[PDB]
Amino acid sequence: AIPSSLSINWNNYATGAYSSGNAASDFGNAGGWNQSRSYISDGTLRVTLLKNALSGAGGLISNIDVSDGTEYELDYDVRFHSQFDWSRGGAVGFGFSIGEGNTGGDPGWDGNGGTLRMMWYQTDAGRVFFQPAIYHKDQPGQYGDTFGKSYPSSGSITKGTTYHVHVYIKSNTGSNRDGRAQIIINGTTVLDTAIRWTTNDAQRLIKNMTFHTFRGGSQTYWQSPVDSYIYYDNLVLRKIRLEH
Template identity: 60%
Template sequence: MARSDFGSVTGWVSSRAMTSGGRLRVTVEKNALSGAGGLISNTRIPDGTAYELGFDIQFHSQFDWSRGGKVGFGLGIGNGNTGCNLPTDGAGGTLRLMWYNNPSTNRVYFHPYIYHQGMPGPCGSNFGKSYPTSGSIEKGRTYKIHMYVKSNTGNNANGHVQLKIDGQAVIDQSIRWTTNDSRRFINNLSFHTFRGGKADEWKSGTDGYIYYDNLYVRQISK
């Protein structure tokens, strides 16, 4: 359906996705990281300078947190930098979501995972934000995710990034996504669900299941 609607969808692995109870269930496979054990799917969307999206997410009641991973839908700007490829040329950025099991605090939480012009590196920025601000996310609970991205112009920090979870603002601030105006347009809907990180501590010895529902994507301005 996505290919029919948008004409360009990459990275879908049918064996790791199924419909369960009216929801999409994605399997993140044991002993594997990144695309080797999950989904790294990208869909080309019409160029725009502002988009919003939303979706529901739930981790299975027996899900093994391991160290963490990327989850759900996100938005890409210009070259859509990911994978510790810092956008030093000012030609790309991304907003995605992670879950993270912090060994120093024994908390499991969501945080934004952002690539943007001027980021410190070595990989995506989280701006020190997390949800919840105390305690941990829960297996078996449905969380409502909302994202908003607005492009900036030139070298100005007049873009915007917003992530809300269950109506609570996790990050909501101005940002400089790019400095190359020819690459300032939001053009990609990502669906990245996998464990990692790169080290073995991010792996799990069991298959895990993550459920998605109620996706919407809206172009707000061209």
């Protein structure tokens, strides 16, 4: 199944292992799954971040191919373990790819792809927050654009707290800035901007849903010496439009 909508609550599973076959049946498809790091914990999907490791080497980086569209939304709950080691930060949650789906230091300067995802980050002074990681035509650096936004805008996020995250994306047309990127967390708008995802219209469509949970960053101080856990629940995905 290449779905256009999904509603997953993991409520039908016994506490225990969660295979990529399980992931395929809930998501329709889920590529790049690493089932030794997925686990059902009390009606909840738990993802393990391995100690002394970053990116795919320690986390779970899955893409769910979806029905191509020009407008999409999703909702989900995310909770860090009550004893989570924040460390420097990393990627969390469900987002969207457009076109070639640029990530990982490959900026969308060529007008052929981008992504809408979210990170956590801890500053030198110890403030911890969520922040956008947006790859798009006009991203200023090789890595994701934050638009300078953070949730909360003052203070820090908190371990053990359930954050309800709403993500909405809209394709742009041609070379116009008439696309949209939007992230709302517990009712607060973190990001809501016009954006130019692409300049090549053959790559303007939303093509899959990202499910990326990892530490880093690529420097070793983003690592943690303990295995760490992030809990997801209530994923609702909905195609809104396809406008060729």
